[PDB]
Write a structure and sequence with these properties.
Strand order of the largest sheet: 1-2-3-5-4
CATH class of the largest domain: Mainly Alpha
Number of domains: 2
Bound molecules: the ligand C[C@@H]1CCN(C(=O)CC#N)C[C@@H]1N(C)c1ncnc2[nH]ccc12
Radius of gyration: 19 Å
CATH topology of the largest domain: Transferase(Phosphotransferase), domain 1
Strand content: 15-25%
Helix content: 25-40%
């Protein structure tokens, strides 16, 4: 699980987010271009707060073992003990947002429900580890195959101490505001139940095939003082994203429950899973 810097050969960018980037590299210790492709995350530049967070992220992912969480492979170092890069499995079908847009006409509602169930199970597992994800969105889901997706980034994830079932951040966060639960917008509170809110938005993303014209940003902005206050207002009045075109009624009802105003009245991932499998 220790990868030597000198054997990581840089090929291409796979994505970026939250002060980090993921690159496609070949781990090629023979130097003949036959080594395994890996996905390698690093900070885009040096930062002391970001480095502390990055080491924590690595320890979170290292301790996750699930069919629905991207596989941790190891780390590369540089000044010891200074983690330079997080090495993960590379899954070439890539991000679910991109995959849905491209294969839209090939994937039916059963496939979307399968993806929904897999994401829900990943999240049930995450919450069992006292991990709050905080950034659940289709952009952070990875496609292993046409019938298998995995939660694939943990840049903002936090571990809940044993005696507190939420965490409050000091500043407002810097993620697109359209996945945030009301209590995160109003009071920077995050919990496993704000993850459920975000999962409702992920269901919306799936059933819109991440179409840009009716995306959470496009549609909320169209429906919508500062933007965050307008969105909070809109949400506090009980307005919600509209059912996606052709959305099964049962799924739309599940989204609405995920979007209960109060965190306590949202269903658990434990409860959602069986309901998704039933559908
Ligand atoms: C959807 C995956 C998680 C989010 N991504 C980031 O780059 C976040 C940052 N920084 C892209 C990544 N993705 C395109 C991947 N694509 C292919 N293999 C991958 N392994 C691990 C991630 C990954």
């Amino acid at each position: 699980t220790i990868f030597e810097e000198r054997h990581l050969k840089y090929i291409s960018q796979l994505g970026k987010g939250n002060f980090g980037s993921v690159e496609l590299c070949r781990y090629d210790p023979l130097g003949d271009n036959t080594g395994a492709l890996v996905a390698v995350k690093q900070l885009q530049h040096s930062g002391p707060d970001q480095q502390r967070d990055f080491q924590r992220e690595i320890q979170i992912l290292k301790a996750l073992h699930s069919d629905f969480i991207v596989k941790y492979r190891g780390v590369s170092y540089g000044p010891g003990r200074q983690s330079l890069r997080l090495v993960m499995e590379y899954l070439p079908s890539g991000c679910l947002r991109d995959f849905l847009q491209r294969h839209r006409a090939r994937l039916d509602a059963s496939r979307l429900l399968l993806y929904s169930s897999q994401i829900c199970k990943g999240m049930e597992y995450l919450g069992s580890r006292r991990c709050v994800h905080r950034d659940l969105a289709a952009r952070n889901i990875l496609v292993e195959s046409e019938a298998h997706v995995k939660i694939a980034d943990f840049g903002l994830a936090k571990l809940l101490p044993l005696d507190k079932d939420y965490y409050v951040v000091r500043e407002p966060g810097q993620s697109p505001i359209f996945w945030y639960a009301p209590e995160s917008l109003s009071d920077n509170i995050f919990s496993r139940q704000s993850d459920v809110w975000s999962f409702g938005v992920v269901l919306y993303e799936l059933f819109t095939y991440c179409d840009k014209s009716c995306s959470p940003s496009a549609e909320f902005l169209r429906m919508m003082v500062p933007a965050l206050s307008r969105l909070l207002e809109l949400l506090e009045e009980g307005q919600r994203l509209p059912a996606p075109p052709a959305c099964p009624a049962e799924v739309h009802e599940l989204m609405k429950l995920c979007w209960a105003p109060s965190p306590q009245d949202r269903p658990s991932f434990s409860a959602l899973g069986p309901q998704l499998d039933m559908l």
